[PDB]
Amino acid sequence: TDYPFEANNPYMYHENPMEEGLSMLKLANLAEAALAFEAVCQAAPEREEAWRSLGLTQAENEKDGLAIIALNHARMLDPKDIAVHAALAVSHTNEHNANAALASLRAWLLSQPQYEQLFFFAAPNEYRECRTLLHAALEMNPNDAQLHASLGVLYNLSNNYDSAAANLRRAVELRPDDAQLWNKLGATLANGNRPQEALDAYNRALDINPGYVRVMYNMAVSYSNMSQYDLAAKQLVRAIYMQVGGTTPASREATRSMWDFFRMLLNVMNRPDLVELTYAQNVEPFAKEFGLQS
């Protein structure tokens, strides 16, 4: 009752929405896969992996709010699920909840048998501790790609983007097919004012996962920072289209906020005619207008 389950869910009827959810993560994609996991969580609230998959899917679908709600259930149900802790650190970092982000990185580390034995204004000591534990882990294991991913998240939180991107760069050399890691390197680069480099990263991330809505929004953000509004427009049509798939009564607000960002770009680029048509909420005419479809 703390998670705003989607009312219009055909997956509630199904027999095996979890296996289906897991198929859709690769083959239909995130919005639909999330619905499937939503159905499993309603039915068997105690399935940690139902909550976990939902949370990671939601974050990938540009909804850290719901991700967090979801991952906190998984974290209560299995506190040694390191994937939930890593994801918690990412969503909180994105939502600027510093204390939680740092507690999720700590937990992520110390929940591993491998590493369990082990100034930043908002949380100087929480950060001191994290940086120390994580750097100690890195001399135990210099080539743990996920250790580098975590230093990357740590250093994002403290706006040390140079050091973050370095670690995330070592991370993608170890795991060059990890879309998650490419996005992280991408966001690090965008946020550190290296937007052309960011797009390179984001483009690797989309080649691995063409339904990765967070990456499409990120790309739009960077193209907008560089005032290339046509390119930005194109990525937000893809974003809006992909993030819905189905039909969505929290969710309205994610969709509308994205429509609003795109609409504002249409205003900025002098297309009053296209600005008005956003209110209708139909993406396809924009897909055609921005070279995406016939």
Binding site: E62, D64, V90, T93, N94, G152, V153, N156, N183, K184, G186, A187, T188, A190, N191, A198, R214, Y217, N218, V221, S222, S224, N225
Partner: peptide, 5 residues
């Protein structure tokens, strides 16, 4: 604007 990890 701010990018999301």
């Amino acid at each position: 604007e701010l990018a999301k990890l």
